[PDB]
Amino acid sequence: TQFEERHLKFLQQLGKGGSVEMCRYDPLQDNTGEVVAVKKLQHSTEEHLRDFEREIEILKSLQHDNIVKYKGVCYSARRNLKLIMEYLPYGSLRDYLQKHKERIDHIKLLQYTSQICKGMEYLGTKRYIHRDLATRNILVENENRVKIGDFGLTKVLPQDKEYYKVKEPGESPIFWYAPESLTESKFSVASDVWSFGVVLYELFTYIEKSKSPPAEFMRMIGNDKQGQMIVFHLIELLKNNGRLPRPDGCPDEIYMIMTECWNNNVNQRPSFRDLALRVDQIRDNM
Ligand SMILES: Nc1nc(Nc2ccccc2)nn1-c1cc(Nc2ccccc2)ncn1
């Protein structure tokens, strides 16, 4: 079925990077229409249109309980596509956790960790590399279900390679990046596992600003480091086993999982299939 542009009523802006807005698809014009999440380009360049269309193809091919649901495409404006998605009412996990802090216990954090793992394992079966796994890109459906959203940086692996090489990087979440992604701009399932270790760290710090991966890494390299010098010092730190600390009150077994995801050897990092099995075992034990 189709979405006519004239019937999409703007409600609220949700986020920018592209922009995501909350809209009501209301063709009956009685405000009884479905509330949807709408992604559109803000600077619709020919390269950005090409990437956005690929992102739409990626989302549409994915059907999993922990992946935001594709609803459609609104053409009504080909050079000005609007991606229609289900609206997830509790927002990003980063905001949700920061708002409802230790009132979410370890058992609840591990239910979210398991869902993120499962979503990521399914994404890997389609040979897609997220590249931007972070709590800000994880959305909350309700208190019992989280879903990976934002496939803006997602890449499809070439047919004959287990990595994707980014020739000209744009804005990059460097404090979530694997060493090989920082040094050689190489992205793989293994670099998404390293970023997953960082998500686990974010969860267990309860999004405390002073404990954030940029705040901790800046302190370790020195707050005096600026621009490209941050990337130089971060690479040297990671190569020398400088890691994010164990969050206050974090169980030993969860910190062990983080440290295994943060292995310098790409092949030694765990698989998302084993992480989901391990996390479900911890939850069972609790
Ligand atoms: N499907 C869907 N529902 C929502 N709901 C929402 C978001 C923020 C506040 C309240 C509700 N977003 N969303 C969405 C958002 C999005 N990226 C994004 C937006 C805000 C922040 C961080 C990242 N990418 C794809 N879908």
Curated annotation (Swiss-Prot):
Job description of the protein: Non-receptor tyrosine kinase involved in various processes such as cell growth, development, differentiation or histone modifications. Mediates essential signaling events in both innate and adaptive immunity. In the cytoplasm, plays a pivotal role in signal transduction via its association with type I receptors such as growth hormone (GHR), prolactin (PRLR), leptin (LEPR), erythropoietin (EPOR), thrombopoietin receptor (MPL/TPOR); or type II receptors including IFN-alpha, IFN-beta, IFN-gamma and multiple interleukins.
Effect of K39E: Loss of ability to up-regulate potassium voltage-gated channel activity of KCNA3
Gene it is expressed from: JAK2
Self-association and partners: Interacts with EPOR, LYN, SIRPA, SH2B1 and TEC. Interacts with IL23R. Interacts with SKB1. Interacts with STAM2. Interacts with IFNGR2 (via intracellular domain). Interacts with LEPR (Isoform B). Interacts with HSP90AB1; promotes functional activation in a heat shock-dependent manner. Interacts with STRA6. Interacts with RHEX; this interaction occurs in a erythropoietin (EPO)-dependent manner. Interacts with ASB2; the interaction targets JAK2 for Notch-induced proteasomal degradation. Interacts with MPL/TPOR.
Name used for this protein in its record: Tyrosine-protein kinase JAK2
Domain of life according to the entry: Eukaryota
Active site location: D132 (proton acceptor)
Domain Protein kinase positions: 8-280
Family: Belongs to the protein kinase superfamily. Tyr protein kinase family. JAK subfamily.
Disulfide cysteine pairs (residue numbers): none
Residues of the full protein shown: 842 to 1130 of 1132
Phosphotyrosine modification, residue list: Y25, Y122, Y128, Y163, Y164
Positions in coiled-coil regions: none
Binding-site positions, ATP: L14, G15, K16, G17, G18, S19, V20, K39
